[PDB]
């Protein structure tokens, strides 16, 4: 029960709920254990007991409420402090010593003011703990220290208001701030005894204010830092000094006193109302229709000289409001005369003549002009906006002439919008020009279409009323008028437009989905077999055709990917259909080019005309006279997905079967896949190509077409002729049993995998090529024998570290141990370089650990550290692979590396 | 002035690949490569304007 | 060494000003008559002023010693330009005139950098002479480019000055270190294709290599073939018209001077305090009352920014953050209408200046401002809430010029998503654009669809939570600058996919949150991406309060005591990890489940009543993922026998763990927490559904379900198959639809990382497709084994 209750104490003191406020717990042993619990489980840990300080413990003491109850009840009786613990009494003694040190530092002024702000925020708890410490004056001492603290904070406010007021004119005249420039920047972790509340009275601080003059100056700037008029007077009298480094006591005379004199003459003028209109419209110009801040500003304005504000604020704010609405009515009258002139309506107004004859008049008094009030009753509630709408109307005259010229009525708008929505572009500004023009002329149709040429004033304001109702639904309407009025050249080209022959970026996708024929060719020309030049796309019609490349398709995909939002199902479903059939077709191109670069010889003449039509189908073809045309209709997406799936399956099966064909034949491992394709194409000819003769001369030596035809004449018997004719017989009865294309496609790729030479009757299979190369090397005898040097094991890899300058002589030093042997060739040595294919090092590992070789050779991997991370890692996996599968245990594999580049993969893992 | 022009150079002067001697071509007036020999004893200067 | 090559490139520029010396003087007279006194109202020569403009473009802009040049060049002019003051005010007035010919912008500084930039780039692209701008983030180069984009259109200019000038059509190419020369060759041929067939006197195209300072020393050497492309137009063909193209080479990096000496280095300098406070005036000049109210804070903010930017060695902070601070305190001063309480200043400086670990920016900004000391603690959650969910009054007046930037969260091991869709995303869920991991997908079509989804979210106005940025930094950079082109009161950012840059609409309330890891953002991002995006850290600790930290420690030790059982029924010594009993435990799930518990509570106040129920509800969600052999093993566990009895009663009477279908009847009858979409993943040890189990589930769910469909992730090679199956499931009639998504983990296939892709795709489809009447219950079942795969 002690352990569960201390854990319950820890969980209720881990929350912020005070535990003991109802405990009548007169058994003192369990109560002392609870007190030890609340101390050691409420103490402020900071990842497990650091304290080392006084501030956090003191904040702990003032904020948590169970500590004062703890100290009260343990200072009530000594029969409770005797039974706590050794540890809890040590922490209570530490907290009591901390509180005694801190609240005995209040008796002098040495108390840090952080603890002073804490005890004034926490008055009652501090009074309680101090009354318990009293049994081992404070009300008046706290009020005295609180008054001195408030004086300190208001003096810091005065001095900071002074620095910011002198900081808004720092460009013009700079001041050396005595010592105050450093004293104000420093923090209040400072001792309070430095702020000197001495007697015989004044209270000097560490901010040495050089007199009470600058102190009362800072007080008056603090009471007047929120007066915009005062800041105006400040900057217009501190421009009257010009680049001068100046001291603080002449700032009060050269810069403050003329400002105060101007401010006080303006105040005693404004108290009477003898001010003229020139300063009224020169100072208060930025206050139009914002009169609550001006009411507050006159309240703050009369706080300078401390008397009443009853009959002074509201009449003059109203008078200045009448003056502001007067000048607004003058500007509105000028713009309404400008729009009455520029619209061509002659009409009759006859009521705004004396207002403009007053607009060029000048009078000097501050009094309310009466005879104009009723005239301004026609223009009370226009606004400070909407005069903008009248000046974009009154300034755009070419558009209103073009609209009276070309459209002439409201009823042609519904056909003009539809005629423009073709001739507009496809991007979003180009589309939204029609809607901005439409909303502009629908918003101004009440004026530009409904005016008689001679209208009176009353019906003119009656139409402006509903114009303002039409403006209240759309605040951006004069900008729409302006942005339509700067598109007059487009609006002139729209009506007289001929056939603009650009189809679209959208209807081009519909044309591709209607009759696009995706064509994979694998071209027979002199170019390479890059993935750009194997994919084409044709668009028929008349009878002309358009051929699209891959990059043109990508550019038009980027163009149609960023059109505007039509908000209709057809457009996004057709661009989705086009994008995904293009992505699936590019996936087909990727898998086909992987199968071509792996070396296949079955799909080297492959083609596939893929139709994007609804129920279009795929029309494949081969360049073979023993095969028929493969075709199947249906939807394009899942059929191309399935076709790529069996094509990837054929890729995995072909890679596995060519791996097990390389594992059986040794002389097939000299040449890569494309050289194997070239040799299989070239050895069947009666006169093979001379590049094949030179490239096969590394095996036989002095290669001759007579020896080659002797080697290929005895490499196959007559039973294979029976087998290939059995292939020609059994397959036309096999493809007709499957009505679909996928089953017969699987059948033909199995039968090309296992019995390859029947499908291509002009090339040698890999069995015949391997047997011919083995017979060629059997004809050319006397193989090379090379032993490893001393200390070099002839059954394990020999990683040798030579250094970059001595790799190349060391390889020839290894190879010169047997004199009168021929020099090496492209086998058994690879001068490795950055960006080296994995196939060449893989074929080297096939060369050095294949069983049928009739000789021992030294196989070298020079500069093996130059390989990449992926190439070296895959070479490591491949060497582990073939050492796992099957090999001879007398190979001589030698690895040479630079000794100064040992941080790469392959020499470090070996 | 160059290395203080906004942010600094992307590469430093020690991993720079396009050197002439021990100096990069970045700090030269003209980004020119080295003259091959038998053109060094045949060049001849015009005036200094 | 451009001696006798700048004078023959400058007499032509003087000829260009002299030919157009008919309306510029009238514009100068009108601008200095309607905005100045009579001292700048003197007669100006048409040829001498053109000469001062020629030497101001050719030599004065590139130099940093402009005062020495002005006092050493004014001794040769006649009487009206004897002093350098006259040349200074003349170039200032013409640069101000070219800025006033641009469309009007609000809260944009009239500093010398912007006017000087637009001056040099406009005059250099009329004359087809390349400009080579360099600088740092905050130097106003892209903002001047976008100003030239909508300012100097041919027949549709805002002013009558640019209407007599040429028409611009800009193509962009953001360079990378992995950039081929064929890319810039294709860009030059493409803009020549735009230039072909048009009148050269009123149509010129420009290329803008916005990050040319990245690719100067790539081993492929892309910027070595830029030397002929700037002079004869193309390589391996004869020179011809419609081939010479203008150039504005904006860079954030210092360049190679030897091959770029052909153009004008307008090299930008570091900001001093005078230029900083002039920009502070320019981004508050739109109002006049609160400008004079908050003019006092500009110099302390400038000094604090100077100390912050000189303190850090890495260039993590820039001028954009200080400008955003100025705009934010301006907006708060305008909305407050009483002044600035110091909590506003601390909130602004903590929302703007954040991100770096070894930076106390609040302490630095309060060192120069001792009055604005805030003693109360402020956390990251209210900062994220005030940056993602702003006030209703913000961006509601006439046009938008004052707003925040796009938020970024700094996390590790992808933890931001859980705390984002738990805490802050309220009402409308965002659309998560992410790096879909379905096999053999094409990355180009994927990023095309992703940016199309970003554009649709911009037009419809919903939040975007990006999880990748390395595939979209080249293609989304212009939208992140937060500068808009206005046409009828509608904003327009620029989006591009390679070489096709077009404008796209932006709604009034659109946010964009980027989620990236700390390591990749600190040593993979190129650093101008840092300045554009507002940084914040909400990984795991800032949202977790200390009492919730006590609860997560208590639940960790409680799960460790749950898994610890001692028994002698079977003679074996097998220690049971908490991952064995609680399936999916990875020593971090207690924090996720205490987050789930405190949000399922919903009151969020500590009165000792919420603490016990959030602890017991967290324990309930732990036992809700406990295998039943463990909860019947619990009788001999370390917890006890009465606690084990209560937990077994909770597992067998309150929570239904009998089967899938019983969980369906226990899930549909109870009304949920005002959500139209309840999601729940399910861990199974049995075999997944075959195809006849959904039939019988529809048989005894004839009154609640709507024929649930099972989906297997083995059959889904491409995203579009999953998309069409989910879309076909939404378009079926009936309410209370049930979705079952199955995936197996113990087999030879790869599909185990596709679960998160399928989950986010389902969230995107239900956000973009579901109406307002249909409830949707989506369940994700997975197959696991008891042989170590659990
Ligand atoms: N006059 C100005 N000068 C500089 N930045 C400004 C200015 N006015 C606004 N900005 C801010 O700067 C951003 C737009 O311009 P920037 O992106 O800084 O131009 P930039 O500094 O050249 O950036 P780069 O170099 O193209 S990555 C926005 O965040 C604006 O709020």
PDB file of C-alpha atoms in Angstrom, chain A residues 140 293 305 308-309 472:
ATOM      1  CA  UNK A 140       4.128  48.203   3.460  1.00  0.00           C
ATOM      2  CA  UNK A 293      -9.456  57.302 -35.199  1.00  0.00           C
ATOM      3  CA  UNK A 305      -3.145  70.360 -21.889  1.00  0.00           C
ATOM      4  CA  UNK A 308     -12.227  68.993 -20.514  1.00  0.00           C
ATOM      5  CA  UNK A 309     -13.352  67.892 -24.011  1.00  0.00           C
ATOM      6  CA  UNK A 472     -22.520  45.842 -55.245  1.00  0.00           C
TER       7      UNK A 472
END
